[PDB]
Amino acid sequence: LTSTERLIQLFESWMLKHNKIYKNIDEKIYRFEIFKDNLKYIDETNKKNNSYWLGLNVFADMSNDEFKEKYTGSIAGNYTTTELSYEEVLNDGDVNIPEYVDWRQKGAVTPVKNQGSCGSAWAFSAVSTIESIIKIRTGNLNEYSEQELLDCDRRSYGCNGGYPWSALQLVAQYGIHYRNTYPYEGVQRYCRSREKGPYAAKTDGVRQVQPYNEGALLYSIANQPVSVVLEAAGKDFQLYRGGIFVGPCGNKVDHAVAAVGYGPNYILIRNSWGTGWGENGYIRIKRGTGNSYGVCGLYTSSFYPVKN
Numbered sequence: 001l002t003s004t005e006r007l008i009q010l011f012e013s014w015m016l017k018h019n020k021i022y023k024n025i026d027e028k029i030y031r032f033e034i035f036k037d038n039l040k041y042i043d044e045t046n047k048k049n050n051s052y053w054l055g056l057n058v059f060a061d062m063s064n065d066e067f068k069e070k071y072t073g074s075i076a077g078n079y080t081t082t083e084l085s086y087e088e089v090l091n092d093g094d095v096n097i098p099e100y101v102d103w104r105q106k107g108a109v110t111p112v113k114n115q116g117s118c119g120s121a122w123a124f125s126a127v128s129t130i131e132s133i134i135k136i137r138t139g140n141l142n143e144y145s146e147q148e149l150l151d152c153d154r155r156s157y158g159c160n161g162g163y164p165w166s167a168l169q170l171v172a173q174y175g176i177h178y179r180n181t182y183p184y185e186g187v188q189r190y191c192r193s194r195e196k197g198p199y200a201a202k203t204d205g206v207r208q209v210q211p212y213n214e215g216a217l218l219y220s221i222a223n224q225p226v227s228v229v230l231e232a233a234g235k236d237f238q239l240y241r242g243g244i245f246v247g248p249c250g251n252k253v254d255h256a257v258a259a260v261g262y263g264p265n266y267i268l269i270r271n272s273w274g275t276g277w278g279e280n281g282y283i284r285i286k287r288g289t290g291n292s293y294g295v296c297g298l299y300t301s302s303f304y305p306v307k308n
Contacts, residue, residue: 014057018275035060041239051286055241058276068234071273072254074122074162080229080253082165082301088208092216100263101222104282108132108225109260110143110179112281114274116186120158121255123150124272125227126167127179128258130201132225133305144201145177147184151191152176159187164229164256168206168303176201204308211301212292218262224304225270226259230285230296237296240277244284245296253297262287 001007011032022028038060046053062070103109110131112124126149134140149167152174156163177196209217209226220226232238232254237247244265260282261268267287271278285298292299 018058031061034065045236050246052245052247053243054237054239056239058239058241058274060239063238064235068238070119071238072232072234073119073160074158074255075164076161080164082208083211084208087205088303089210092219095218097218099218102263102268103132103225103260104268108135109258109270112270112272114272115184118159118186120150120162121257121272122162122164123158123167125164125257126171128225128270129168129227129305131258132260133307137307143179145179145182145196147182147188148176148191148193148196150184151188152193168203171201172203175199204306206303207306209302209304213301214289214292214299217299217302220302220304221259221262224306226262226302227257227304228259228298228302229253229256229300230298233296238277240283242279244286246286247295249295251293251295251297253300259302
């Protein structure tokens with residue numbers, strides 16, 4: 001709507017769908033001042049005859065603003081160095097396989113989630129490292145827990161910052177409850193793995209996919225629910241909606257979630273942000289490229305589950 005006055009019913013119409021709250025009388029209204037140019041940020045960004053477009057609303061109050069610290073928020077700090085090097089590897093050669101399969105038709109994924117004021121997000125992935133590995137040979141259902149491996153993993157913080165290495169790698173000697181049995185509020189001072197019911201989540205030998213490799217990772221795209229790590233470009237992709245990407249990005253990884261989705265020049269995923277960005281809960285980076293590092297630090301190695 002190009003008419004200044006006719007933009008008001010949105011605040012009304014918009015907020016109804018994905019939350020109605022605010023700061024208060026004076027301060028909140030400010031949410032409306034840096035979302036005023038919602039369409040400016042896209043209008044043509046879309047006009048891009050390009051390979052990526054992405055639509056508006058999940059929060060345009062959210063993008064460049066302090067919000068980028070919301071999303072990205074985790075990890076950071078010191079290097080999140082990788083590859084256990086040995087053990088995480090080989091017994092697979094050429095391909096002689098289809099580059100395509102999905103989990104958007106089988107139904108292997110549980111409704112991901114939009115938590116709260118702190119994104120320990122880095123911990124969502126783990127809850128996934130197993131979320132679907134369950135059917136691989138057992139057909140077992142249900143989900144384990146969130147807050148745990150976010151509360152028992154002292155190894156580091158998950159709020160203001162969270163480590164991607166120890167939520168899945170410390171999974172065999174303690175174990176973890178279910179999603180229902182232990183939903184979370186906002187942090188968990190009293191972390192109880194030996195105290196939350198009993199033993200439920202026991203690993204086997206987290207199989208790290210060849211680092212800096214856009215090759216063998218396809219077994220982890222189809223023979224398991226891939227869970228790499230990418231760049232949380234707290235900006236333009238921070239309002240990402242649909243399409244395939246080539247971006248505007250910046251390879252230096254930021255967030256590590258579920259990577260369930262690979263095909264021709266498509267490839268889904270799992271994005272626990274919510275019901276609007278990275279469409280409903282997924283994405284798709286432009287496959288078949290030429291640069292390892294490329295953009296959005298994807299194919300720079302995983303650490304997924306296999307049943308020993």
